[PDB]
Amino acid sequence: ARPCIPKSFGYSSVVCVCNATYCDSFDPPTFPALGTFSRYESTRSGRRMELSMGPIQANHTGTGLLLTLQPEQKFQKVKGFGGAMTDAAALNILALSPPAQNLLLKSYFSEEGIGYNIIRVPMASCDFSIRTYTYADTPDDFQLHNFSLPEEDTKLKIPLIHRALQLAQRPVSLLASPWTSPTWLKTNGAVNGKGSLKGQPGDIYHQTWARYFVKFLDAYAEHKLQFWAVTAENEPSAGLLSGYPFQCLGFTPEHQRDFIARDLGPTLANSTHHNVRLLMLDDQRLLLPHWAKVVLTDPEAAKYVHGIAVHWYPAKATLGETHRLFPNTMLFASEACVFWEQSVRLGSWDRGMQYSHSIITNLLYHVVGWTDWNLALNPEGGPNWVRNFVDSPIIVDITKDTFYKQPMFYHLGHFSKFIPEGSQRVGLVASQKNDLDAVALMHPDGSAVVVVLNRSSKDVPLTIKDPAVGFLETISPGYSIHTYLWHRQ
């Protein structure tokens, strides 16, 4: 219905300006007839998920590249796409006026937007908080009688999550991750730095930390929010590095294995939230497949682990080999973000290409879902209480009641909007060596989705063949991303 309002900030492409009364949006989707496809196009030149239609022809004539759908070659089923509701994200959204907040939330979660269905919720503070805190900072409270949610949850995070769920067509799955435990449970007595839990898996410390998970889930349940999954610890390897600046909690692979087997696994299974999935790792994929071997060879740990969470910050040696060793334990991208460059580059087409190329690689190596980091940030990449400023698909300018949708937002949306939960990745065979990145999936309803990323400068003429329908003649322009959709019957 409403097109993008472009604005350049000196980088390779434009942002889309939104405020309290205007934001670009989609109409409700349609079901075009057999023999007709839908194409959504975003380009560095300024096109933003523009919709067009064309025919799927019975015959083909030409000399160029051919991608052939192979719907019988079936792979993983998709859980979904989304981003993280951090303190920083919540503060930046709520700095807008209410009408602008809803255009922002609709941009992510509505069918007028790109249809997110995953929200990652940090358990207490991380670096994208304005202060250090946990849910139980009074010491010597091993039964956790003084566990409580601060204003960050009750005032900022939870109300925004409620509003996101109301705007969403598809069911939204919440995913929780802790950064640090209370400091009186740690070896170093600090929120950051090199430090693990006190003692050994099984004792009062590890039982208290595991109970902290149930107490967290109880609190959000009282606020009428249920979680799909929790991770065992955010980037547990970081808590083994000397003098680590952000909130952390150190686990070596065997410590995570024993903590899951003795404490976290049983405690979650004995609780009201026994259906909540447990994801391991939640860390860099270079720690794979080793981290999976350690944890998942132990059946007492493995019986509790539903999946392996990975961060994006070679895929065959990591994701592919881990799938070969443990093909029934799903892989899930739980966090991705973007030395000499500033933290926020308003309008960077490169960082958008980085997002879509990575999602394509993850999908081509069995990953069932991808989760962004901060849903929103200010123009300097904050607030962040340490330093680590990064980019975000939506950048909020408080002083002008305005937010900007980066190219990252649309590169994500080319996947998040058209691959609902339950979609299965299927085969897509290139007729010859080419420079494009492509992935094919099938909706639960049988229709086809194909995303085509062109990171090169040259236009690439392209034909997509569906054995059941025909030939889709198209062109992939240089520095562009397309999504194609068509009924198969």
Ligand X SMILES: *[C@@H]1O[C@H](CO)[C@@H](O[C@@H]2O[C@H](CO)[C@@H](O)[C@H](O)[C@H]2NC(C)=O)[C@H](O)[C@H]1NC(C)=O
Ligand Y SMILES: *[C@@H]1O[C@H](CO[C@@H]2O[C@@H](C)[C@@H](O)[C@@H](O)[C@@H]2O)[C@@H](O)[C@H](O)[C@H]1NC(C)=O
Ligand Z SMILES: CSCC[C@H]1NC[C@@H](O)[C@H](O)[C@H]1O
Residues taking part in catalysis: 235, 335
Q: What residues does 440 pair with on adjacent strands? A: 426, 450
484 near ligand Z (CB under 6 A): no
Residue of 55, 384, 427 lying closest to 245 (CA atoms):
384
97 near ligand X (CB under 6 A): no
Q: Which of 7, 8, 21, 166 binds ligand X (CB under 6 A)?
A: 21
By beta-carbon proximity to ligand Y, the closer residue of 122 and 470 is 470
Residue 52 binding partner per list ligand X, ligand Y, ligand Z, none, with a CB distance cut-off of 5 to 8 Å that depends on partner kind: none
Instruction: Report which DSSP code applies to 372.
Output: E
Q: Which of 37, 216, 244, 246 binds ligand Z (CB under 6 A)?
A: 246
311 near ligand Z (CB under 6 A): yes
**Residue 329 CB: number of other CB atoms within 10 A?**
18
Q: Residue 419 corresponds to which tokens in the numbers above?
A: 């691959």
58 near ligand Y (CB under 6 A): yes
Total of chain residues touching ligand Y, rule CB under 6 A = 2
* Cα–Cα distance list, 321 to 212, 224, 324, 344 (Å): 34, 39, 5, 34
22 near ligand X (CB under 6 A): yes
CB half-sphere exposure, 414, CA atoms < 13 A: 33
Are 409 and 396 in contact by the 8 Å Cβ rule? The answer is no
Residue 58 binding partner per list ligand X, ligand Z, ligand Y, none, with a CB distance cut-off of 5 to 8 Å that depends on partner kind: ligand Y
Binding piece for ligand Z, criterion CB under 6 A, among 26-34, 66-74, 121-129, 287-295: 121-129
Residue of 83, 47, 75 lying closest to 415 (CA atoms):
83
Rounded to whole angstroms, the Cα distance separating 393 from 412 reads 9
- CA end-to-end span of the chain: 28
By beta-carbon proximity to ligand Y, the closer residue of 59 and 63 is 59
By beta-carbon proximity to ligand X, the closer residue of 19 and 434 is 19
Rounded to whole angstroms, the Cα distance separating 393 from 384 reads 17
| Backbone dihedral angles phi then psi of residue 276, each to the nearest 5 degrees | -75, 130
Residue 1 binding partner per list ligand X, ligand Z, ligand Y, none, with a CB distance cut-off of 5 to 8 Å that depends on partner kind: none
Instruction: Report which DSSP code applies to 29.
Output: P
Strand locations in 111-183 (E): 118-123, 173-178
Residue 112 binding partner per list ligand Z, ligand X, ligand Y, none, with a CB distance cut-off of 5 to 8 Å that depends on partner kind: none
68 near ligand Z (CB under 6 A): no
Are 402 and 423 in contact by the 8 Å Cβ rule? The answer is no
5 near ligand X (CB under 6 A): yes
* Binding string, residues 332-351; x marks residues near ligand Z by CB under 6 A: ---x-x--------------
Are 211 and 273 in contact by the 8 Å Cβ rule? The answer is no
Least distance (Å) between residue 62 CB and ligand Y: 12
Strand locations in 20-87 (E): 36-43, 50-55, 65-77, 80-84
Binding piece for ligand Z, criterion CB under 6 A, among 124-132, 133-141, 391-399, 429-437: 124-132
127 near ligand Z (CB under 6 A): yes
Binding piece for ligand X, criterion CB under 6 A, among 17-25, 389-397, 408-416, 463-471: 17-25
63 near ligand Y (CB under 6 A): no
* Binding string, residues 384-413; x marks residues near ligand Z by CB under 6 A: ----x-x-----------------------
Largest CA distance in the chain: 76
Based on the number of CB atoms within 10 Å of its own CB, is 275 exposed (0-12), middle (13-18) or buried (19 or more)? exposed
1 near ligand Y (CB under 6 A): no
Binding piece for ligand X, criterion CB under 6 A, among 16-24, 229-237, 347-355, 426-434: 16-24
235 near ligand Z (CB under 6 A): yes
What does 366-435 look like in DSSP terms, one character per residue? TEEEEEEEES-B-TTS---SSS-----SEEEEGGGTEEEE-HHHHHHHHHHTT--TT-EEEEEEESS--S
Q: What residues does 16 pair with on adjacent strands? A: 6, 405
Total of chain residues touching ligand Z, rule CB under 6 A = 12
By beta-carbon proximity to ligand X, the closer residue of 18 and 302 is 18
Instruction: Write down how long the chain is.
Output: 489
Contact positions vs ligand Z (CB under 6 A): 126-128, 234-235, 246, 311, 313, 335, 337, 388, 390
Contact positions vs ligand Y (CB under 6 A): 58-59
Contact positions vs ligand X (CB under 6 A): 5, 19, 21-22
